[PDB]
Amino acid sequence: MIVSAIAANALLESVTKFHCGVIYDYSTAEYVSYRPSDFGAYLDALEAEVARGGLIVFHNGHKYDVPALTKLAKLQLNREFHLPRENCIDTLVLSRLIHSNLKDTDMGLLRSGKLPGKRFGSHALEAWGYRLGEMKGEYKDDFKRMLEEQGEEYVDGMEWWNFNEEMMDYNVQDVVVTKALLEKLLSDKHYFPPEIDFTDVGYTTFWSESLEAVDIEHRAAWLLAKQERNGFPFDTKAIEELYVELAARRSELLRKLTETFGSWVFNPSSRDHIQKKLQEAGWVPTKYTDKGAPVVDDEVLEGVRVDDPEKQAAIDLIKEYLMIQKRIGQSAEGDKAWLRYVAEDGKIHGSVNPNGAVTGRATHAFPNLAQIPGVRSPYGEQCRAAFGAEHHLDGITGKPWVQAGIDASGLELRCLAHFMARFDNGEYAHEILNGDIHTKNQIAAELPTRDNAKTFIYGFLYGAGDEKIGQIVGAGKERGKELKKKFLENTPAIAALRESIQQTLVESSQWVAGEQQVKWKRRWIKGLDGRKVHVRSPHAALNTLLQSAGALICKLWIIKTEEMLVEKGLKHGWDGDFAYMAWVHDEIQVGCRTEEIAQVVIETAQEAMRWVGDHWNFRCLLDTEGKMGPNWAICH
């Protein structure tokens, strides 16, 4: 096993030159420093550990280091360099796996004065140096202050322009933190057994003798990192033709909404507006917002009735206006608007954090690819059309690629059937397969319509009170208790589900001054792969359990699907046959060169989904549904 970290001139998207890199070998117990004229030997040193079947330790290597060293080797050395996914370890991923509950952990770290306020809960290399006590300083700061006593100034991120001896010393600093952080993660015996000193093993022993969660997360991080580099093809012209239809509508709406109110200036998106208005048109607020004056409150606006017809009719103009700002602020004027993120390949490369959550459901940002308005939401149809494989060319024919959208068919309710198959012997599970589970929940909870059962089952499982439940039948917090208790009597298994599991984490509970001081057995629920999935209050926790199952199911699902597609003969990327464009929890969007490839993609995903269920011996049956088409509005 070797440990390293590198320093380049820029980010993964325009890096040009390799500066330095340090390699600590556990077998040699000694570091080795590299320099710009030593880039070639650096790649061989990594190849040598691959030949031995050892391991290579990087921080964020799956997402940056490994693809950058592949990219740098092509333009600088003109050689092909591809670190095998099996021979790579990412401390960042393990940190996100092992220490997903950092947010609490920092409380004691704050008391010490050892952890910066800007580096709270962060999983960056330097942020961990302060946690372990290895930060003698930071390269960026030993650069700025020393530039003063040299004359010349500082430009935002110029410390990486040129190879400097201070970078070479802080390049070591990043390596020793990676090593100590690795051993800090290897010292967690829940994930890494004591019987195996993983610091001196081959890759073959590392993955299997480690917890299964260790393997998936590195497979998940590697695949999704490929997805970011693949990117999502984007029709720039289409979104441009929308801002025109929106800005014109905004100005036309703004004009009509300035005839209704004067000044001494009507504001599009201000909170000091409705606060000044409606309570002058004859509207007395039903619900307020905190220390002073109610917020925008989109909810009440639908029900605001004022005796002024013009003011009343203007309410719906406000409803549209605010929404127009939302799409615009997401598609054009936002600091993280889509038009700002289109790369020079005609694609949007939205990033994704693998286990950036307690449960394992990922997070998307810059731009949040997982919040694009739905086709049911206004103008979402046009929005979804802007994200499509058709908006990509082709390596040869040029004929637009076809998109394949496959989602997990009702994963949440089937996950519920799996954990409750422990109490009903597959009763509820068969109701899924037999169909109309929302019809049974309707009968069990005594709801008038099937749609009311749908909004019930999800709210009840996740800890909704009685207001959302009461508003279903046009009531308040009153109606809810009898709706929840009746469902419990008609579905004992669900009640029995929360019995053994919720009493598996407690010995006895106790209320002290309004705070439950529960004596825990373990403040963490085990996931499908043995990882720690904490919760908070034992009053529900089920929501955490089900979402953990679902997110862990899809994570393995998208891994095996790609694994089978590669095994069948398909090549991953825009230069091969298919390319992952976006992963959104229970649905995925895959680009495909021909319709024939897309059909295989759909079938393989179903084959992988049954494979996952057999793998973890899932009590319930998992199915998926695929849609073929040009873009995303079609795949959903």
């Binding site: 073959t204 299997s208 057999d614």
Partner: protein, 70 residues
């Protein structure tokens, strides 16, 4: 005479490595993909200590006792 040599070896391999390789769809795939199968396999049978019989197609006496005697 009730399990083919691959299944009995499967038991022996798992038993040798303190696991139930038969009763884990997860463990079977594990040692295969990360190359842990050949590792345990050479560790056990590498000394040519284990030898088996396979036919399972209605074993007889003449001549099977001959094979046992042989």
């Amino acid at each position: 005479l009730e399990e083919s040599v691959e299944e009995t070896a499967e038991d022996l391999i798992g038993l040798h490595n303190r696991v139930r390789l038969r009763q884990s769809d997860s463990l079977k795939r594990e040692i295969i993909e990360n190359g842990k199968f050949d590792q345990w396999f050479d560790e056990l049978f590498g000394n040519d200590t284990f030898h088996l019989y396979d036919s399972f197609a209605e074993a007889e006496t003449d001549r099977l006792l001959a094979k046992l005697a042989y």
